[PDB]
Design a protein around this ligand. Structure first.
Ligand SMILES: O=C(c1c(F)cccc1F)N1CCCC1
Ligand SMILES: [Zn+2]
Ligand SMILES: [Zn+2]
Ligand SMILES: [Zn+2]
Length: 572
């Protein structure tokens, strides 16, 4: 009931009852809120309400203190003070940006912009508020009751009338009823049970809204610069493999936190694991939002670090198949590999947070909450894809607003930049270097002469809102008969519905751009499918074409992105 003010930390009794988080506001700040917003309910030990029987006045602006009790204009005794006076709300121990965060629906980009340009305590308020709002939106969607079970990977669904139907991608993970988590793909719908169960007809699925805990720790701890490497002990015997990263590794030990911008295939995993070999006695917690990113760091560790000193931390509510080659759930091992949501309460000499473009400010805070560390390293690329903002439908979120780390990387620049792409044919490196990396990304590989582009708008059909371009899949089919080396190629598009069609016609393994991020394939076929802001997003485009080691075919809808591709153009 008595806590600290989210804007000035000033001790107070006052909480906003109208805010969904109910933040402590100090007399001077609580006023500026309630006088400028539809937010009028204030809480103390007891609510600021008229205490007269049957009186429904709760608006703090229309209330008075009569003794130790509160009354409206109609019930106040002659000797009474207005609760709102001289820029204050009467409480014990006697902001434009707070108001916008407190009252926005989170459907506008500008909401996310403000949640990242504001002060540090307002980043936490925003991050809880947003996440709270995201969770209570899941309740808006209708229940899926099973009408008929066709097979072990297909069934038919009956949807709740009067409630919208959630996108049936892999993004939207349902909870079945507790028959385990389930996902769906597009009357024949494809079902995938994290726990395998003889699917019972009549059983139902619901999206698991998880309670949003409060944030305490900042997104980013305060920066500390040191004169010598602090708390870490370097080798003099670091293998030439990692000699390229020694100067950056010393920067890591002479700062509290450091930022690494690593474009695709520039040696991020190599950097992260090489840090353990440079500071060989240091305890390092390796974290990322997704299981795939933490498992990617496990593969690299398996190759270079002693397997006995590694532990993969798996939450007992296991949702996807996870890295198996380490001892599982040994929190005390020198090397700990854990998703942000599973992190234990522990300490560490270095924390490495990977895939930083995918992190929210909520995730940045949780990490700082669960891990007390001498050094924090943030690895990723603001030119790659951010975490999906399910509520955002109006305006595009720029990379400087993805989170606090990406905002630093886009304004004052990253502390360290890996500038040489060792994965991609020069045609792809040249294209993305000019598009998102200000001509600072360099190609280690030669031109493959296997990078082709074709301008072909085709015809755009929709499965609800997910896009399909059959003629673009048709052009790929034609190309494959003539280019049989591409039979091994991964098919990539910005839409699962296009991928679903391309899976039946082509038989290629299928991937969305967003699910492709962090993976590489010798050959990539990309159909842009549509000209929308989704399919023309330069970050998504960057990730799409930088998956390829040897060749790429890009069937394009957007003239701009087609022209920019420094690829050999095809006809038809
Ligand atoms: O100009 C740079 C840069 C660099 F070239 C070296 C170090 C830090 C930097 F921000 N970049 C633009 C986007 C990709 C990196
Ligand atoms: Zn409020
Ligand atoms: Zn205050
Ligand atoms: Zn009253």
């Amino acid at each position: 009931a008595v806590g600290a003010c989210v804007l000035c930390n000033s001790q107070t009794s006052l909480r906003c009852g109208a805010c969904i988080r109910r933040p402590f506001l100090c007399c001077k700040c609580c006023y500026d809120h309630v006088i400028s917003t539809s937010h009028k309910l204030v809480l103390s030990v007891n609510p600021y309400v008229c205490n007269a029987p049957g009186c429904d006045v709760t608006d703090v602006t229309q209330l008075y203190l009569g003794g130790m009790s509160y009354y409206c204009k109609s019930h106040k005794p002659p000797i009474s003070f207005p609760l709102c006076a001289n820029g204050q709300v009467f409480g014990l121990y006697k902001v434009t940006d707070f108001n916008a965060i407190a009252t926005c629906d989170w459907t506008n980009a500008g909401d996310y912009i403000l949640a990242n340009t504001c002060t540090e305590r307002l980043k936490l308020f925003a991050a809880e508020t947003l996440k709270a709002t995201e969770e209570t939106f899941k309740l808006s969607y209708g229940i899926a009751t099973v009408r008929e079970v066709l097979s072990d990977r297909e069934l038919h669904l009956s949807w709740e009338v009067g409630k919208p139907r959630p996108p049936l991608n892999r993004n939207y993970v349902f909870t079945g009823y507790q028959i385990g988590e389930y996902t769906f793909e597009k009357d024949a719908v494809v079902y995938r049970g994290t726990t395998t169960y003889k699917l019972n007809v009549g059983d139902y699925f619901v999206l698991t809204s998880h309670t949003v805990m409060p944030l305490s720790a900042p997104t980013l701890v305060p920066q500390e610069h040191y004169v010598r490497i602090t708390g870490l002990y370097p080798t003099l015997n670091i293998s030439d493999e990692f000699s390229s990263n020694v100067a950056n590794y010393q920067k890591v030990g002479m700062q509290k936190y450091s930022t690494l911008q690593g474009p695709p295939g520039t040696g991020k995993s190599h950097f992260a694991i090489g840090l353990a070999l440079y500071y060989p006695s240091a305890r390092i917690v390796y974290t990322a939002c997704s299981h795939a990113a933490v498992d990617a760091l496990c593969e690299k560790a398996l190759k270079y670090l002693p397997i006995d000193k590694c532990s993969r931390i798996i939450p007992a509510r296991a949702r996807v198949e996870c890295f198996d080659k380490f001892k599982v759930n040994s929190t005390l091992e020198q090397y700990v590999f854990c998703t942000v949501n599973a992190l234990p309460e522990t300490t560490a000499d270095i924390v490495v947070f990977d895939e930083i473009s995918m992190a929210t400010n909520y995730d940045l805070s949780v990490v700082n909450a669960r891990l007390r560390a001498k050094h924090y390293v943030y690895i990723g690329d603001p030119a790659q894809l951010p975490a999906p903002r399910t509520l955002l439908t109006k305006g595009t979120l720029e990379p400087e607003y993805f989170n606090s780390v990406c905002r630093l990387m886009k304004t004052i620049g990253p502390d360290m930049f890996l500038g040489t792409c060792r994965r991609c044919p020069a045609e792809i490196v040249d294209t993305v270097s000019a598009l998102v990396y200000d001509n600072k990304l360099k190609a280690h590989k030669d031109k493959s002469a296997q990078c082709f582009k074709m301008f072909y708008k085709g015809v755009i059909t929709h499965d609800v809102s997910s896009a399909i371009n059959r003629p673009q899949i048709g052009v790929v089919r034609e190309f494959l008969t003539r280019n049989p080396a591409w039979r091994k190629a991964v098919f990539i598009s910005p839409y699962n519905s296009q991928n679903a069609v391309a899976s039946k016609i082509l038989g290629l393994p299928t991937q969305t751009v967003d699910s492709s991020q962090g993976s590489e394939y010798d050959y990539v076929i990309f159909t842009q499918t549509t000209e929308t802001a989704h399919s023309c997003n330069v970050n998504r485009f960057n990730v799409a074409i930088t998956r390829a080691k040897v060749g790429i075919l890009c069937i394009m809808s957007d003239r701009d992105l087609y022209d920019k591709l420094q690829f050999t153009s095809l006809e038809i």
